Amino acid sequence: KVFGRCELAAAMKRHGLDNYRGYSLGNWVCAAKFESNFNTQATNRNTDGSTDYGILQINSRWWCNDGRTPGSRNLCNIPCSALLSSDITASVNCAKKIVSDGNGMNAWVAWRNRCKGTDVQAWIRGCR
Ligand SMILES: [Cl-]
Ligand SMILES: [Cl-]
Ligand SMILES: [Pt+2]
Ligand SMILES: [Pt+2]
Ligand SMILES: [Pt+2]
Ligand SMILES: [Pt+2]
Ligand SMILES: [Pt+2]
Ligand SMILES: [Pt+2]
């Protein structure tokens, strides 16, 4: 699925991301835009043996198990294929675990580089 920004905002809000650990909803929508272009099926297969999965481009070394990545920790306790679902719940729950495991949103390079310090509310502006 490729989400619209307002539809993704509403789905993320239903799952408690607005103000999760002090990150407003627009931050999460912005991260998804620049990680995956709102595409639940996105993958980026890296040269280091790992792969980034789904709408939030969660990596298979620390966070999910794809079976094929050296150094697997599987800290979200999920197969990486669960992060390619059309519904966002597994990606949201794993994103919350990423923050809960010592990280800010700085764990996402696209967030740091394209959302941090910007008008993130533009991504929810005008949404019902
Ligand atoms: Cl829900
Ligand atoms: Cl729901
Ligand atoms: Pt789809
Ligand atoms: Pt949902
Ligand atoms: Pt939901
Ligand atoms: Pt939820
Ligand atoms: Pt949830
Ligand atoms: Pt749900």
Give the CATH number of the domain where residue 29 resides: 1.10.530.10
Positions marked active-site = 35, 52
- CA quadruple 40, 42, 43, 44: dihedral positive or negative? negative
For 59-88, letters b (16+ CB in 10 Å) and e give bbbbbbbbeebeebebbbebbbebbbeeeb
Q: What's the domain count of the chain?
A: 1
Rounded to whole angstroms, the Cα distance separating 30 from 33 reads 5
Angle of CA points 112, 92, 21, to nearest 5°: 60
Q: What range defines the domain where residue 57 resides?
A: 1-128
Method by which this entry was solved: X-ray
Please tell me what resolution, in angstroms, this structure has: 1.0
CA 48 to centroid of ligand 7, rounded, Å: 31
Which residue type does 77 have?
Answer: N
Helix, strand and coil content of the chain, in percent to the nearest 5, comes to 40, 10, 50
The partner residues of 43 in beta bridges, in order of sequence, read: 53
The verdict on whether residue 101 carries a ligand-binding annotation is: yes
CA 95 to centroid of ligand 4, rounded, Å: 15
CA 15 to centroid of ligand 5, rounded, Å: 6
